[PDB]
Amino acid sequence: AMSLENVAFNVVNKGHFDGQQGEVPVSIINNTVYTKVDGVDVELFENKTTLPVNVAFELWAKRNIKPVPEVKILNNLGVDIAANTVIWDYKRDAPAHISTIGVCSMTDIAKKPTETICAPLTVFFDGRVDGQVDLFRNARNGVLITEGSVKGLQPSVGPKQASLNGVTLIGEAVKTQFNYYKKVDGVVQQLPETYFTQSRNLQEFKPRSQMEIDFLELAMDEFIERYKLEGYAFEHIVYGDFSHSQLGGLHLLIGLAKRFKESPFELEDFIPMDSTVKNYFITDAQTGSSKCVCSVIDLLLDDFVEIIKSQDLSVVSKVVKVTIDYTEISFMLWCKDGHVETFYPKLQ
């Protein structure tokens, strides 16, 4: 019963695929899906994926329209595929996963996640869908999200935010904080202690603590004095050094947000995907200070201060490993005479 014309009918009348009956006239030209609306063609979808246009159209129409974990979380947890849904990746304008289970005849490797092809894959299960907690309970590999408790299983409290139709938000009218569960080879895992990235924008940056309010409001030297940060190189790492041709530090999103209020800068996202650590080719418009690979992480300033203040400062250079978004992030810590020179997410 699935068809191009039926997917298009659902998009036109329901804003997305809603299992409704009906067909609309469709025309495909190159990578674009159009529909006839009173004698003229109207664009419904432009394929930006590496899948065929009609296939990507159907997967985009069948995307999950509930708040879902951000793609970076799913990737860090080793998710290969979702059970009977499509996690659409709005950063890549493409499906987050290569294959599907019970979604599209062209991409499906199975109809149900109980089929033996899914046994080695880490299947994403959503406890908000009936029967998915039980499917995770019998799955060999999987990642489960829930809104509440699961009998016997100990939860890992996930981030406060989730993606709803490409908008990362902390839900007020919807629940976005999930309990995370993971199984590897039939064994429930104890998920590690983890920090979480805040997933904020440069243009819409809002502080989420009194320390972050003080960072944005106070001058550099009075914030450093207030929070006893002397010797931690926040002037370089967080504020940024725009005095040399190569831009110094600037690895925390809150520091880029502070700079952004004063003067603009170019951020070239050369690997445009969702990731815990982002790399930008940054050009500061005021000074002309630039850096080809400037690693940026959006940690709550308090969490970053806690991380940097919990490090031994007696070695010239070492790798500092921190669990962020369930993954191991390596940082390079450079010290001199017991003070930090730089601390940055390792470009590895």
Ligand X SMILES: CN(C)Cc1csc(N)n1
Taking CB under 8 A as the rule, does residue 54 contact its own copies?
yes
The 10 Å Cβ neighbour count of residue 65 is 14
Q: Which of 72, 182, 183, 236 is catalytic?
A: 236
Taking CB under 8 A as the rule, does residue 147 contact its own copies?
no
Taking CB under 8 A as the rule, does residue 341 contact its own copies?
no
Q: Which of 97, 182, 183, 291 is catalytic?
A: 291
Residue among 112, 138, 174, 228 that touches its own copies (CB under 8 A)? 174
Task: Look up residue 333 and give its DSSP letter.
Answer: E
Taking CB under 8 A as the rule, does residue 52 contact its own copies?
yes
Q: Which of 72, 183, 251, 258 is catalytic?
A: 251
Active site residue 97: no
Give the residues after which the backbone of the chain is interrupted, taking a C-to-next-N distance over 2.5 angstroms as a break.
none
Q: How far apart are CA 91 and CA 320, in angstroms?
A: 28
CB 16 within 8 A of CB 65: yes
Q: b vs e for 310-321, b when ≥16 Cβ sit within 10 Å of the residue's Cβ?
A: ebebeeeeeebe
CB 317 within 8 A of CB 334: yes
Crossing angle for the helix pair 253-262 and 210-217, to the nearest 10 degrees: 30
Taking CB under 6 A as the rule, does residue 269 contact ligand X?
no
Taking CB under 8 A as the rule, does residue 70 contact its own copies?
no
Residue 346 assigned as binding residue = yes
Active site residue 16: no
Backbone angles phi, psi at 255, to 5 degrees: -70, -35
Residue among 12, 153, 218, 229 that touches its own copies (CB under 8 A)? 12
The interface with ligand X within residues 138-197 (CB under 6 A) comprises none
Contacts with its own copies by CB under 8 A: the residue count is 93
Residue 345 assigned as binding residue = yes
The interface with ligand X within residues 32-91 (CB under 6 A) comprises 43, 45-46, 48
* Region for 21 from its dihedrals, namely left if φ exceeds 0, alpha if ψ lies in -120 to 50, beta otherwise: beta
Taking CB under 8 A as the rule, does residue 157 contact its own copies?
no
**Parallel, antiparallel, or unpaired for β 81-82 and 123-126?**
parallel
Residue 293 assigned as binding residue = yes
The interface with ligand X within residues 90-149 (CB under 6 A) comprises 93
Please give the annotated binding residues for uracil, written as ranges.
291-295, 342-346
Q: Residue numbers of the site for ligand X (CB under 6 A)? A: 43, 45-46, 48, 93
Which residues are catalytic, by number? 236, 251, 291
